[PDB]
């Protein structure tokens, strides 16, 4: 199937409570493989998956150095952005960055990403062309000007089309046992009477990997998108995910409803109904 590699970074200032806390994590699809926390006992790029443990200490030293340089750049940038937004130095602020690449089943680049947010709002983002920027406001246009002067986009494009795709390919091979295994959902429908004249049908999906899934309810073969309650896909803690979709139905019409399940571990979409 298709795969993704992403690095996530969060810096949170805490005036009066020391320097900003920095946490970064790396993922291949929905598997975390590295983490670095500035407030850990021994901050380092820590391998979190068996398949990455083979890279060796020199690799971890290099990755650790990159993490520490980014924590330092973020401390400088949190001060800069107080100036750009004319803010008090007293408040807590957050800087986030995500970057990475998506590849198709042939390992070819589908899309590259590099984007930043300040206080949870878009700040500056590399466009899909990997050559232009979307600056959210006039402060981010100052950064855009610096980055267009330093030819940042060109350097990013070369990483995203090169090392990003090559290393994701290497990790997918080294971790093929897990990264390249899709665990289909275990599915069932439960029934819960609401009143004398209505009941809830809840379609469950458990134990699936990756997280991407579609659960839909049809009434007489028509999608019930507007009337379906969908919970956010949630982690089980054993690598797998869970999700449910529910509909409120007139009592006695249960067999007119069908739950449809799409997941990459399924060879074909699955159809299920309330059985008893």
């Amino acid at each position: 199937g298709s795969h993704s590699m992403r690095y996530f970074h969060t810096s949170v200032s805490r005036p009066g409570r020391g320097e900003p806390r920095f946490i970064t994590v790396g993922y291949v699809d929905d598997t975390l493989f590295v983490r670095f926390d500035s407030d850990a006992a021994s901050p380092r790029e820590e391998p979190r998956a068996p398949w990455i443990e083979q890279e060796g200490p020199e690799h971890w030293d290099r990755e650790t150095q990159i993490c520490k340089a980014k924590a330092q750049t973020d401390r400088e940038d949190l001060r800069t952005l107080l100036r750009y937004y004319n803010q008090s130095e007293a408040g807590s602020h957050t800087l986030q960055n995500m970057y990475g690449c998506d590849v198709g089943p042939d390992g070819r680049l589908l899309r590259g990403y590099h984007q930043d947010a300040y206080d949870g709002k878009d700040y500056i983002a590399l466009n899909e062309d990997l050559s232009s920027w979307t600056a959210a406001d006039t402060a981010a246009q100052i950064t855009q000007r610096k980055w267009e002067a330093a030819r940042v986009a060109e350097q990013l494009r070369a990483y995203l089309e090169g090392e990003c795709v090559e290393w994701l390919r290497r990790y997918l091979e080294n971790g093929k046992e897990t990264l390249q295994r899709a665990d289909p959902p275990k599915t069932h429908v439960t029934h819960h009477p609401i009143s004398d004249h209505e009941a809830t049908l809840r379609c469950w999906a458990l134990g699936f990997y990756p997280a991407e899934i579609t659960l839909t309810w049809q009434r007489d073969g028509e999608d019930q998108t507007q009337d379906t309650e969908l919970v956010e896909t949630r982690p089980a803690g054993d690598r797998t995910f869970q999700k449910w979709a529910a509909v409120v139905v007139p009592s006695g019409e249960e067999q007119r409803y069908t739950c449809h399940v799409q997941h990459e571990g399924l060879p074909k979409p699955l159809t299920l109904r309330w059985e008893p």
């Binding site: 790029e45 990159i66 340089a69 940038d77 930043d116 940042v152 990013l156 090392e163 990003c164």
Partner: peptide, 10 residues
């Protein structure tokens, strides 16, 4: 593998 850059200040 992380991306390494200099001059990335905002």
């Amino acid at each position: 593998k992380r991306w390494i850059i200099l001059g990335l200040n905002k």
